[PDB]
Structure formats: structure tokens, C-alpha cells
Amino acid sequence: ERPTFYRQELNKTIWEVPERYQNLSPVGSGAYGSVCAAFDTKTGLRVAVKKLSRPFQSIIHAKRTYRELRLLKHMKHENVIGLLDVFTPARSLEEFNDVYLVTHLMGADLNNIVKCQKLTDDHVQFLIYQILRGLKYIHSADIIHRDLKPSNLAVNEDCELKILDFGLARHTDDEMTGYVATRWYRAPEIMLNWMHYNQTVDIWSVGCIMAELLTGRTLFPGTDHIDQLKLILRLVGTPGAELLKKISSESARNYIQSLTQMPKMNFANVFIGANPLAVDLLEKMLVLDSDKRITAAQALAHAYFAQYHDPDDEPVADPYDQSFESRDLLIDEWKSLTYDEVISFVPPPLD
Numbered sequence: 001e002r003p004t005f006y007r008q009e010l011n012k013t014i015w016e017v018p019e020r021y022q023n024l025s026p027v028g029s030g031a032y033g034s035v036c037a038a039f040d041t042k043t044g045l046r047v048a049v050k051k052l053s054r055p056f057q058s059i060i061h062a063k064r065t066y067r068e069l070r071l072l073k074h075m076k077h078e079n080v081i082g083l084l085d086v087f088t089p090a091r092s093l094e095e096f097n098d099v100y101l102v103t104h105l106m107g108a109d110l111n112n113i114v115k116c117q118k119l120t121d122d123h124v125q126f127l128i129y130q131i132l133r134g135l136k137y138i139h140s141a142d143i144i145h146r147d148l149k150p151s152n153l154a155v156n157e158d159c160e161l162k163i164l165d166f167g168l169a170r171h172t173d174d175e176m177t178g179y180v181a182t183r184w185y186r187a188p189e190i191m192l193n194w195m196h197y198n199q200t201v202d203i204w205s206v207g208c209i210m211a212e213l214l215t216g217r218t219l220f221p222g223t224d225h226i227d228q229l230k231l232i233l234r235l236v237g238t239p240g241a242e243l244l245k246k247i248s249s250e251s252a253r254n255y256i257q258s259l260t261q262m263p264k265m266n267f268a269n270v271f272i273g274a275n276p277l278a279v280d281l282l283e284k285m286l287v288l289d290s291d292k293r294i295t296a297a298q299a300l301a302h303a304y305f306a307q308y309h310d311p312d313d314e315p316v317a318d319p320y321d322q323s324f325e326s327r328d329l330l331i332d333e334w335k336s337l338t339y340d341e342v343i344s345f346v347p348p349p350l351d
């Protein structure tokens with residue numbers, strides 16, 4: 001049956017949501033879009049409710065709405081944000097306009113926990129373990145994050161972590177120019193479009209995050225794309241013959257070769273006093289050639305994680321059908337697909 005919806009005005013927007021969600025309050029200062037913290041009286045959980053803005057304004061935006069809903073519905077992992085609920089006040093497709101997405105509220109992001117501070121090795125262990133556990137699951141569904149950074153990591157009071165914003169196009173709207181955090185975690189092959197990249201772009205990002213948790217400092221705080229590449233190559237060295245063959249962009253390859261060659265720095269000298277196991281894991285993550293980086297699955301089995309690692313509590317995802325990605329549809333066609341996805345949603349069980 002259809003629950004009873006009630007209306008209210010929030011952020012100069014009308015929020016029509018079921019009665020179960022009480023005490024709606026805007027959160028994140030527009031950082032996560034039109035999101036409200038709410039109390040879900042049916043589960044007892046504190047939830048994050050997003051009212052999608054202009055969901056069907058264009059083919060791209062209609063596809064974006066469908067992609068997000070699809071991605072959120074698929075994810076059923078402790079360290080990955082999932083769908084607790086999805087609703088529309090609309091009684092038919094003819095009246096369908098708005099989509100509301102419901103998930104767990106963690107309350108803070110990785111920066112809102114570790115600002116300018118170098119934390120204990122045990123906290124870094126648990127934080128990186130959870131990122132890697134959730135990334136192993138995301139990658140098993142053949143989904144790439146592409147935007148892995150501390151602002152996309154939802155953390156609660158107990159240091160429990162959920163990954164946000166995986167598999168979306170949304171990050172391509174972000175300003176990537178200058179002295180901006182939105183670029184500091186990006187793998188050089190994605191940042192300078194060196195080749196058709198893979199999931200290993202996310203391992204580079206984990207390395208950037210891990211190093212920053214270890215030292216209390218951004219690993220590559222480049223003032224622009226060029227300055228950041230120079231910071232990167234000073235640490236990991238300039239590409240060798242083999243990687244240069246793999247840089248399919250003639251223009252990028254031609255610019256790389258113009259730079260004075262540098263050897264890879266000694267990671268033990270860069271990361272002074274850090275756990276030798278943490279240093280070892282960092283060397284395997286921050287490899288310039290994406291093909292030679294450690295995978296999330298392999299990194300979970302690393303000795304640095306021995307106190308958390310359990311190969312029977314690190315699950316993989318069910319098959320994720322991405323065939324819609326190559327599909328040419330009209331607004332009305334993406335919209336109807338979304339409506340079907342809203343209407344068919346089955347809630348997770350409540351113990």
C-alpha cells in the first residue's frame with residue numbers, strides 16, 4: 001500500500017515525504033546536493049534523504065537519475081552507501097516528477113574527523129581497511145569510483161565508514177582547476193587523460209588518502225594540473241619505456257618525454273617513522289603504471305591489515321547489469337525506466 005505523505009518547505013523547495021520520516025533538517029551545506037537528515041520512526045535510524053534536483057531536465061540528467069538509482073539499489077555492503085528507501089508522492093507515471101533517495105546518515109565525512117592531524121596507526125588501519133573492503137565489493141561489480149577522496153567517505157562517531165559517489169558522471173561537473181582538493185586524489189592517467197583507464201585509478205586515490213592519514217598532510221597538493229604531475233613524478237619517478245608504450249595519447253606521451261627523468265624516491269625516507277608495513281602498502285599503491293598497482297582484494301590480504309582481515313567477511317557483489325550505459329533513449333524512456341525502479345524497490349529487512 002501507499003504510505004501517507006506530508007509536505008513542508010525546506011531550502012526554498014517543497015519536501016513531500018512519507019509520515020515515517022520526521023524532523024527533516026538540511027545537512028552538508030549543499031555539498032551533497034538537496035539532502036536532509038531525518039529520523040526514520042520505522043527503523044529507528046538517522047537517515048539522509050535526497051530530493052533529486054531537475055531529475056528529467058535533459059537526456060543526460062534523466063540518464064544520471066537512472067544511473068544513481070540503479071547503482072544505489074545494487075549496493076548491499078557495510079562499507080558502501082546503499083538504498084534504505086526510494087519514494088515519489090506521484091500515484092502514476094503521468095504524474096511522476098520527483099525522486100527521493102534514502103540512505104544511512106553517518107553524520108560526518110573523512111575531513112570532518114581528521115583535519116590537519118596525523119592519527120594513530122590503528123585508526124589508519126581500520127579506516128583504510130574499510131575503504132579497501134568496500135572498494136573490493138564495488139570493483140567486483142565492475143564499477144569504478146573515479147572520484148575517491150575524503151569528502152566522499154562517510155564516517156560515524158565509532159569510525160565506521162561508507163563510500164559515497166561511486167560510478168557517477170557528476171564529478172565531471174566539478175572545478176578541477178588550480179589549488180583544489182577535487183584534483184589532489186586523482187591518478188595521473190585519469191587527471192591528464194593518458195589512456196583508457198581501469199579500476200586501478202581508485203587504488204591510487206586510496207594511496208593518497210592513506211599517506212595523508214599517516215602524515216596529516218595532502219600527498220600531492222598541486223597548484224594546477226602541471227604542478228601536481230611534477231609533485232607525483234618527484235615521488236614515483238618519471239615513466240619508463242614500458243609505461244610510455246601504454247600512454248595511448250600521443251600528445252600526453254610527447255609532453256611526458258620533455259621532462260627531465262627522475263628516479264622513484266625511497267618511501268622509507270619520505271614516510272619517516274611510519275609503520276614499515278604501511279610504507280610497504282603505500283609503495284604497492286602509488287605505482288605510476290596502473291597495471292602494476294595492488295588490487296583492493298590483494299591489499300586486504302596485506303600484513304598491515306592482519307588485525308581486521310577475514311577472507312570470509314570480505315564479500316563480492318552480485319552481477320551488475322550496465323548494458324543500459326550504451327543505450328540511446330529519450331527523456332520519457334529514461335523516466336519510465338526510473339519509475340519502474342522506484343515502484344519495484346524492496347526494502348532491506350529490519351531485525
Ligand SMILES: CCNC(=O)NCc1ccccc1Sc1ccc2nnc(C(C)C)n2c1
Pocket residue numbers: 027028032035048049050067068071072081101102103104105106107108109154155163164165166167168
Ligand atoms: C551512486 C552513489 N551515490 C551516492 O553515494 N549518493 C549519496 C546520497 C544518496 C542519498 C542521500 C544522500 C546522499 S549523500 C550522503 C549519504 C549518506 C551520508 N552520511 N553522512 C553524510 C554527510 C552529511 C557527511 N552523508 C551524505
